Design an enzyme around this catalytic site. Structure first.
Site, PDB file in Angstrom:
ATOM      1  N   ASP D  53      22.362   7.240  10.881  1.00 13.20           N
ATOM      2  CA  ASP D  53      23.070   6.880   9.694  1.00 13.20           C
ATOM      3  C   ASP D  53      22.259   7.136   8.184  1.00 13.20           C
ATOM      4  OD1 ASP D  53      24.930   6.019   7.587  1.00 13.20           O
ATOM      5  OD2 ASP D  53      25.292   4.253   8.509  1.00 13.20           O
ATOM      6  N   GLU D 131      -5.569   3.490  -3.880  1.00 12.66           N
ATOM      7  CA  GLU D 131      -6.241   2.039  -3.883  1.00 12.66           C
ATOM      8  C   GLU D 131      -5.390   1.009  -3.648  1.00 12.66           C
ATOM      9  OE1 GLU D 131      -9.354   2.071  -6.781  1.00 12.66           O
ATOM     10  OE2 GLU D 131      -9.884   4.203  -6.431  1.00 12.66           O
ATOM     11  N   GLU D 133      -4.141  -2.646  -3.604  1.00 14.44           N
ATOM     12  CA  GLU D 133      -4.527  -4.023  -3.979  1.00 14.44           C
ATOM     13  C   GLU D 133      -3.420  -4.846  -3.386  1.00 14.44           C
ATOM     14  OE1 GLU D 133      -4.689  -4.153  -8.134  1.00 14.44           O
ATOM     15  OE2 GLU D 133      -7.097  -4.042  -7.909  1.00 14.44           O
ATOM     16  N   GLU D 188     -10.858  -8.467  -4.801  1.00 12.49           N
ATOM     17  CA  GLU D 188     -10.486  -8.233  -6.185  1.00 12.49           C
ATOM     18  C   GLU D 188     -10.751  -9.222  -7.196  1.00 12.49           C
ATOM     19  OE1 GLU D 188      -9.289  -6.079  -8.464  1.00 12.49           O
ATOM     20  OE2 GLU D 188     -10.023  -4.164  -7.464  1.00 12.49           O
ATOM     21  N   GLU D 195      -8.682  -5.531  -1.938  1.00 11.34           N
ATOM     22  CA  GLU D 195      -8.525  -3.943  -2.307  1.00 11.34           C
ATOM     23  C   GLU D 195      -9.182  -3.144  -1.167  1.00 11.34           C
ATOM     24  OE1 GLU D 195      -8.726  -2.183  -6.239  1.00 11.34           O
ATOM     25  OE2 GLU D 195      -9.816  -0.452  -5.328  1.00 11.34           O
ATOM     26  N   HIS D 244      -3.811   2.361  -7.844  1.00  5.76           N
ATOM     27  CA  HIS D 244      -4.421   3.567  -8.375  1.00  5.76           C
ATOM     28  C   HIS D 244      -4.493   4.707  -7.724  1.00  5.76           C
ATOM     29  CE1 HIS D 244      -5.405   0.288 -11.076  1.00  5.76           C
ATOM     30  NE2 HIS D 244      -6.776   0.307 -10.986  1.00  5.76           N
ATOM     31  N   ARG D 315     -13.129   2.275 -18.522  1.00  6.82           N
ATOM     32  CA  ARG D 315     -12.638   2.031 -17.190  1.00  6.82           C
ATOM     33  C   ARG D 315     -11.154   1.584 -16.981  1.00  6.82           C
ATOM     34  N   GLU D 332      -8.049   9.617 -12.031  1.00  7.48           N
ATOM     35  CA  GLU D 332      -7.364   8.304 -11.506  1.00  7.48           C
ATOM     36  C   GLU D 332      -6.531   7.978 -12.657  1.00  7.48           C
ATOM     37  OE1 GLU D 332      -9.110   4.793 -12.044  1.00  7.48           O
ATOM     38  OE2 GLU D 332      -8.769   3.862 -10.170  1.00  7.48           O
ATOM     39  N   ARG D 334      -4.029   4.919 -13.269  1.00  8.98           N
ATOM     40  CA  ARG D 334      -3.805   3.511 -12.933  1.00  8.98           C
ATOM     41  C   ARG D 334      -2.847   2.695 -13.234  1.00  8.98           C
ATOM     42  NH1 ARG D 334      -8.823   1.621 -12.709  1.00  8.98           N
ATOM     43  NH2 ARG D 334      -8.612  -0.259 -13.970  1.00  8.98           N
TER      44      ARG D 334
END
Lengths: 97, 442, 442, 443, 97, 95
Positions: D53, D131, D133, D188, D195, D244, D315, D332, D334
């Protein structure tokens, strides 16, 4: 040489071990095993005790009758064992038991 | 037997010993220890072990505290439990100052000097101690309590529940460490027990009283119970003593025996009793070391509160049992199991030796019940009592030249200063019993 | 011995090592880690491992945050537990910036620079650290408490219950990862213990102090207990210190030993002491890093709150044990186990080196009880105090050129800003002691 | 060995006592879907397909085509890392077909495959390393999930060291020996937070693996007595959880983001890819950050970005460019959280980047300053825009977007926006306990 | 010919034996928890491990010394093995081990 | 006579027994032992040792029974004597 395996009623493990020491037999090994008289009890194979011994030909008859007496109040396998070596002393055969 | 350090190193290898514990006492009797990995032991035999001497003598003064323990191989003894990690042993030794002189403050050293004093006169001393203790329950957090494990009495076959197995396991642990127990029995009080050591050489016996205490405690703890060596944990029942049977020997013969006397006791035995009575008042603070010790030294129980000697009477302070020949012995009844056995036996040996030297007659025996008498009767008889509390025992010791010279000044003063502190703390405490008696009255 | 990456990968295969853990600290001495599958390890040895440098230096600033760990195969060590999934090992390395130069904010890098400077004179440093901790109970939900596991005191044989087995397992676990315990003993406070480790090169030792803390903690948690490294978890009993014994060696010989001087200490020994005495106030902030550290540095306990050296007084800030020879050593007593050991040992090393280079006299020893003197008496002696609280230690360090150059500017500033925030938080808290003292009163 | 044919699968079922096969797919919103096939039915499934279905994917909301066929993909067969007494368990995936034999366009996995086909028409393939978490909580006495902490550690702490130390290792081991090839894992920033970092890999197999990761991790934690939560923001006042997404394009195994002849060593086509991503991210924030609770993580003060910017050094930008060069050059992103549909979300990143490369979308200057500490006028002067502040605001952005509509297809586009509209309408009318705390005494 | 080698070790040496077995590529092995006066002092407060290995004759002595090296830091009983059958392959004899 | 030792997957123990009974072999000895398929499973090998004393005619029936029942290794050793104790029979009759 011989390798002796005995399947005894677990309640007679220490009775045979008493007759075993009396003839200078100390090298044993005790296992818990199992192998329609007991059928009635299933709501409330049967467990035996496996004992392994390597003995010299001179102690074969003392060994079995020690096990017979202490177990009578099972079955004793007698095996042709050709090699018995001790781990620490490089011993062989009759010297290694 | 362990004789050389090579004996001990082979046994360590052969029996898979992974830890060695040192065993000693501080001035006041507390049992002390540190753990040594088996890997460190051969170095330990070679150079001794450095440790802090505040463990024995305390922190209260600035005094030399870097000490060296030299291991005595012949005291190597494997403890009666087998962790999966491997076996554990205890060992003892001799403590030295950094100059190489022995440390005079170690109680075991104090005992060794007393042994030397008797050997200067030909004698060596045997002791067989009789250790009383209670077996109690643990609370929910595994904390000690005074809760009973039976309601049994004197020589009863008790307990008969799970505690029967713990008691048997305690006897087994000591015997198969090599104590050679003579006999154990239920004692007068509920949950109270006694184990009778083998009559043995005094030094090795004192080593054994220390081992006995933590082996018994640790065995019971691991079974869910608590072993208590308090002199008097419970009002209204018997307290716990450490009666101390003792004799002297010369040339392998028991010098307390004389077949050609009516009592079959030599005169030196009587001079030894005479010395013990002359000085017992002055070191009751050592045999009876805590405030609780003097709740046991009250009339009405097994405890002797009166200075006397007897063969017949079991009440006496000193009792002489029926045994004759090689096992002729003198029983001193006042000590409790909190004392420091090193100091307690040493002072006993020195008091009796001083009697034999000075030919101190013990006076007549006392074959009557002393508790039944009146003061004028005891006064007429010259029957004096022991110190009535710790403070009185402190005051008596402080004046005693005999105790000071036997212990040595460092030990003598350290001991008295610490007991004087314990008494000053206790004497100020307002106890529940005072609120019950007075809160509504006053 | 692990020497090459080929030695490691073979031992990983042979011993079924499934997970590798890195091991480092941040600026503030917190232990940091991440887990590498054993399948990743060959690539890690070949290319390094990229990780976020905010793990070491925090998040408060925009700075270079992509670092590279180059694994050092000789720091591979298998941990003392065996999960069903397979074995576990820890590894260390050197941290690099993408441009290829070392990252200077790594506390381990700060220690290598002090090692490298000390080698310009031909000096090498050994440390034997003595770590005190408390063995506490867990509550019903498995979380830490300060509930006691025994009531013993200094050098007691205690615990004798189930915690007897935890303490043994902890000593066993460390010994059998190759720590080589010298001795462990019960410490002054209830439930307090100390482990004394053998002397080793200061880099291996600082790596091992980090390993020790999480190993001891994890062992205790897995037996149902908690191992606490707080300076002062409990008011009114002793706190926990990290006494740091240290030796300096040249041409194979102990720099501090001189067979011809009256005390058998070399001149450089006194110069080393003078350097430590000169600068110690300025990095108390590092050896005593948290607010709780200065509840341990109050008079009345084992903690040294006054700046002085001595051989006779065991409680002086710097102590000389009686041992001479290749084992001549200097005990610096004030640090506590919360300190980053890379930063502490490097600052001690630099300070001692500074004393030797500039011939800094240590002055006279203090052989008396400094507590029992007046505030003028000690000022007559010129005896200073250690900083009374964190804020005071911070202010002493912020104005220090010796500390700033030894740590490097990045570490110096990060460390100070973070500790300043920790103090600014704590100083506004209204504690329950204030309600008890003031709510009824005002 | 690699499963390539149905006979490889059928042989592996025999040799390892695999007794149940689980399908693995997602609905429009990213809820993990499945059903159980006994091993005995599996050979027939490889022959005729399996009917099921389609309401499971597209919901019950509308009268539409609903009887779908799953054409099993033998190369997606993978044994699951637990061995019941009953026997081994595996997962498998497939392609969903309509009754006329045409692929169903509403499967998120097909949506990603069309982005893959677009990148392939330009000669590219996309890799992703996510990544993930997450939080490790305790179960209460009834076995229910809670927010009770298992540790109080912080960033990269070696924590926990109690029983939960063993559960965390168990989760790592299960994934690695399933065949994930984890690169690393750490604690983390927040208490009890963790993570796990995936290996860089083909985007289709990566999205497949993110779905498998979610329920393997939950089942391992549950069976050990713990709870693994992929909520973006279970706890106020501590860090939330993100996903990320490092990514790069390859032209037959050459990283297209690398160019050794430029001062940054990034290619021009890398910067255009960033420009396309920054141009459209507002329009599909409702996909990467899909629930109400996503926007409690998208607030200032933590690891979560809120401002649309790109940077290498900083960062904390929305798009971050690691220092790695050569084959491992990646960008990356984020903002995404782990509650998203990875198929829909990777597909829109790929479509956006391919448009930036096709249209030469200059990404502008990089923002190296802390954007939180700036003022509005500075941000306005910089042109620094912010992401949608709540789910309703994200929905409206998506509603007006023909880029997102084209990339997702009208079926997915409209199904997604209706259900998210309904969830917000449920959320908005709730009277929260915080309102009573603030206003009951006051008003 | 081939042999059945029964070796019993104190349990903490099992993995030193595993590796020493792995040195000459011997991994097909069976391990049982068995119960087989040093230890008399401890009864108020002994388990072995049984190992059984089928080897061809040429590995006879290499297997004995491998178990010897891992275990020493028990005893070895070596028996006559007539036949060994692999169930998946239905191999019989030396190729079956 | 013969001593046969068999290690079967524990999931197939009585399927082996059903095959064993059908050729009238019924006295056995069951025990639990332990002997990279299973590596994936270490987060969340055990065997059954069956010891039989057959004679030289029920020899191959016994092997094929265990071979059959356990399909979905076998060790053969010389048995020199067997002693029933409650009867003191020895040899084949004691089996």
């Amino acid at each position: 040489m011989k390798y002796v395996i005995a399947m005894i009623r677990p309640e007679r493990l220490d009775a045979v071990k008493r007759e075993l020491q009396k003839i200078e037999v100390s090298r044993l090994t005790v296992s818990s095993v199992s192998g329609g008289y007991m059928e009635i009890y299933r709501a409330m194979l049967l467990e035996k005790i496996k004992i392994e011994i390597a003995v010299n030909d001179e102690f074969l008859e003392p060994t079995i009758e020690a096990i017979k007496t202490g177990a009578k109040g099972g079955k004793i396998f007698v095996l042709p064992l050709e090699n018995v070596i001790r781990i620490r002393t490089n011993e062989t055969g009759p010297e290694a038991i | 037997k362990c004789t050389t350090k090579e004996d001990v190193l082979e046994a360590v290898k052969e029996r898979d010993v992974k830890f060695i514990r040192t065993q000693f006492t501080d001035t006041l009797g507390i049992i002390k220890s540190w753990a040594i990995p088996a890997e460190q032991l051969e170095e330990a035999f070679e150079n001794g072990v450095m440790f802090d001497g505040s463990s024995i003598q305390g922190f209260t003064r600035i005094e030399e505290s870097d000490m060296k323990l030299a291991l005595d191989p012949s005291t190597f003894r494997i403890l009666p439990w087998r962790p999966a990690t491997g076996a554990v042993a205890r060992i003892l030794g001799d403590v030295y100052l950094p100059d190489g002189n022995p440390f005079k403050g170690d109680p075991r050293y104090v005992l060794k000097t007393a042994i030397k004093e008797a050997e200067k006169m030909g004698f060596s001393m045997n002791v067989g101690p009789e250790l009383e203790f209670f077996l109690f329950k643990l609370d929910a957090n595994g904390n000690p309590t005074t809760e009973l494990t039976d309601q049994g009495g004197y020589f009863d076959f008790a307990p008969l529940d799970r505690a029967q197995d713990v008691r048997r396991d305690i006897d087994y642990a000591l015997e198969h460490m090599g104590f050679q127990i003579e006999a154990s029995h239920h004692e007068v009080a509920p949950s109270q027990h006694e184990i009778d050591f083998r009559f043995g050489d005094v030094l090795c016996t004192a080593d054994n009283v220390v081992t006995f205490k933590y082996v018994v405690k640790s065995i019971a703890y691991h079974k869910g119970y608590y072993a208590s060596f308090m002199p008097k944990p419970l009002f209204g029942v018997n307290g716990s003593g450490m009666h101390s049977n003792q004799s002297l020997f010369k040339d392998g013969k028991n010098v307390f025996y004389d077949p050609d006397t009516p009592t079959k006791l030599s005169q030196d035995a009587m001079y030894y009793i005479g010395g013990l009575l002359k000085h017992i008042r002055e070191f009751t603070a050592v045999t009876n070391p805590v405030v609780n010790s003097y709740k046991r030294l009250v009339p009405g129980y097994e405890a002797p509160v009166y200075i006397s000697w007897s063969a017949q009477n079991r009440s006496s302070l000193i009792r002489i049992p029926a045994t004759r020949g090689n096992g002729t012995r003198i029983e001193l009844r006042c000590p409790d199991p909190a004392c420091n056995p090193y100091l307690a036996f040493a002072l006993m040996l020195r008091a009796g030796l001083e009697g034999i030297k000075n030919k101190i007659d013990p006076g007549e025996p006392t074959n009557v019940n002393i508790f039944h008498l009146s003061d004028k009767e005891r006064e007429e008889r010259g029957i004096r009592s022991l110190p009535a509390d710790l403070k009185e025992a402190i005051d008596e010791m402080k004046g005693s030249k005999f105790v000071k010279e036997a212990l040595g000044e460092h030990v003598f003063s350290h001991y008295l200063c610490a007991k004087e502190m314990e008494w000053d703390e206790y004497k100020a405490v307002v106890h529940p019993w005072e609120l019950s008696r007075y809160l509504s009255m006053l």
